[PDB]
Write a protein that binds this ligand. Structure first.
Ligand SMILES: Cc1cc2nc3c(=O)[nH]c(=O)nc-3n(C[C@H](O)[C@H](O)[C@H](O)COP(=O)(O)O)c2cc1C
Ligand SMILES: Cc1cc2nc3c(=O)[nH]c(=O)nc-3n(C[C@H](O)[C@H](O)[C@H](O)COP(=O)(O)O)c2cc1C
Ligand SMILES: O=C(NCCO)c1ccc2cc(CCc3c(C(=O)O)[nH]c(=O)[nH]c3=O)ccc2c1
Ligand SMILES: O=C(NCCO)c1ccc2cc(CCc3c(C(=O)O)[nH]c(=O)[nH]c3=O)ccc2c1
Lengths: 313, 313
């Protein structure tokens, strides 16, 4: 009875990892994720230049989830590239590096420089597409032209297996369209569903105030709020992309949640808010709980139930 | 101290009503909603001919919310028109009538016929824009040209103040765009934010099965999942539509949830899932709890804090 998996030519002790953005910004964070019993880790989404990000407060959490508008604070590509090439310990677990350049040219620049480290060290690329392009255009993934563009250019510049981080979708035509676009690109080997549910508003009743400072308090939502959304999107893409892997992200707090993500078709399972709230010790709980569910049901491997959600009739 | 209000030339005992879809399909349903404490009622979205809708099970609810894919079952427009014409007791409360035709033609044909009853009785039209189109093109609200067409055609045929039911948006550019369209139409006096959060999927861990039979288990989400989403949209439309009323829908289980909807800008507050779950008694509780918050803060009127949510700095 085990949680092991081989995929994209790497071996993983278990399906669990942090979500990009959570506990992965500094050397200190990365070293902690690495010492944890997560199956893998992903670095904070970076830009070329170091960024300070938005004014604080900019993240907040509550019993049923979180809201954030961090504005992409990170130490700069050079920092994460050096961490990938010089400091990370691959014998402990695989590394993902998430890039989130503010234009297609910034993304091409970084990936060209990432390629040789990817080849030499085996670091994996997660391209963040649930990012802004020009203001007053939808973020990149809600704009299938822009998305096609970024993917051709990044496939050309990088020329290696990478994966993509998707915002959630809510309409069948969008699922149909976005999957068709993704299927045009043999090198997109994996799809992460989903990024935060965009522009929610949390209001505090005692103070009659929004709880984060940027954007008049509008920010991305994570946690329990988003589980059924995360599952629909995992399962939509798992059904429409028979040749790609789906990574589930969204509202995982328990093994049962991880179990549901996996029945929906998830290969890896990421943890954002719950990790932020609970700290890296969460990873041992998640594993035990999922293993308990598997034992009770007679499952021995993840592949026995992955994608095996049943419909009625 | 009390909660009465005046809008669109009708008096309301309080700002609560059912959401379209819930306890509003048969004559028995509507008679019950009328005998409740709700300030108003809306009828089930209707089509010209009666519909059986989707295979059961087609609705399910859980502690954090609900999922449905009813498929628009209804007794047909003749029935709801006759209810609006001859059966409804307007001395008890205002009535809204929701129409949700499958094409613009079906919708224009309904409204020409409803126009004279509206004149004569004062029934109000809620145009459901959050419906199929589910052929090959996105649904109407997520397709701004189709949205402009239905609005032009309908305001032509109806020629009276009416309102539109909106699905949620998740992007600043879409709020800017959707809002600009609605502002093209002086006859649209109210915007209801929001309809169910489209296409989530609820999987049950024990039986490893989806919970509803149509659309392979995919359906609209209501309840506690959607509250911060319902509040971002109320407030995004509140700020961008200064000449329109905003009606909040989504995630109301308490006086507090209603309070936050109003702080966000809502004038009427709609209850769906919580009503389906607790029954019409919910209105007396919500009234009380909302009056209780007001008293503790020394607010006398909804007008005092409607829309007056604070941002930081
Ligand atoms: C503080 C914070 C920072 C985040 N940063 C990123 C990021 O840099 N890149 C990214 O792709 N997603 C980011 N996310 C979204 C998470 O990666 C994840 O997609 C989302 O929070 C849903 O997961 P959860 O439900 O487990 O929180 C961030 C989320 C939070 C709460
Ligand atoms: C069983 C069911 C039927 C519904 N039918 C309709 C409908 O016919 N027309 C409509 O505009 N919305 C319909 N809705 C959406 C609700 O009006 C409301 O927008 C949504 O449930 C979110 O509100 P809540 O969080 O209070 O449930 C329905 C919802 C449910 C649960
Ligand atoms: O300028 C911004 N925000 C306020 C001004 O409009 C801004 C800039 C870059 C951003 C970049 C992202 C992508 C990184 C990211 C963030 C994040 O760092 O804010 N939060 C998420 O939940 N998901 C994400 O993918 C999200 C929001 C951003 C907002
Ligand atoms: O046949 C349908 N679905 C199965 C796949 O085509 C179908 C047909 C008409 C529909 C019409 C609507 C509009 C009514 C509605 C419903 C509803 O009655 O299903 N549920 C909601 O949460 N919000 C709504 O606005 C919603 C879903 C529909 C699905």
């Amino acid at each position: 009875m085990c949680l092991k998996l081989n995929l994209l030519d790497h071996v993983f002790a278990n399906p669990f990892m942090n979500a990009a953005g959570v506990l992965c910004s500094t050397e200190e964070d990365l070293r902690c994720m690495t010492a944890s019993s997560s199956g893998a880790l992903v670095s904070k989404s970076c830009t070329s230049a170091p960024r300070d990000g938005n004014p604080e407060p900019r993240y907040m959490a509550f019993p049923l989830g979180s809201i954030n508008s961090m504005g992409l604070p990170n130490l700069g590509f050079d920092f994460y590239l050096k961490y990938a090439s010089d400091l990370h310990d691959y014998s402990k677990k695989p590394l993902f590096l998430s890039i989130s350049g503010l234009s297609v040219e910034e993304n091409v620049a970084m990936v060209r420089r990432l390629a040789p480290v990817a080849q030499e060290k085996g670091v994996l690329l997660e391209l963040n597409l649930s990012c802004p392009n020009v203001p007053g255009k939808p973020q990149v993934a809600y704009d299938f032209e822009a998305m096609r563009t970024y993917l051709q250019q990044v496939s050309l510049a990088y020329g290696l297996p990478f994966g993509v981080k998707m915002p959630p979708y809510f309409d069948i035509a969008h699922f149909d369209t976005a999957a068709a676009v993704l299927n045009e690109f043999p090198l997109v080997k994996f799809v992460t569903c989903v990024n935060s549910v965009g522009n929610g508003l949390v209001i505090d009743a005692e103070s009659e105030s929004v709880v984060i400072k940027p954007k008049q308090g509008f920010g991305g939502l994570g946690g329990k709020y988003i589980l059924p959304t995360a599952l629909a999107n995992v399962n939509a893409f798992y059904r429409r992309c028979p040749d790609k892997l789906v990574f589930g992200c969204g509202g995982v707090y328990s093994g049962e949640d991880a179990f549901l993500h996996i029945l929906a078709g998830a290969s890896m399972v990421q943890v954002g808010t719950a990790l932020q709230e609970e700290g890296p010790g969460i990873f041992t709980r998640l594993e035990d709980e999922l293993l308990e569910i598997m034992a009770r049901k007679g499952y021995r491997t993840l592949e026995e139930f992955r994608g095996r959600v049943k419909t009625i009739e």
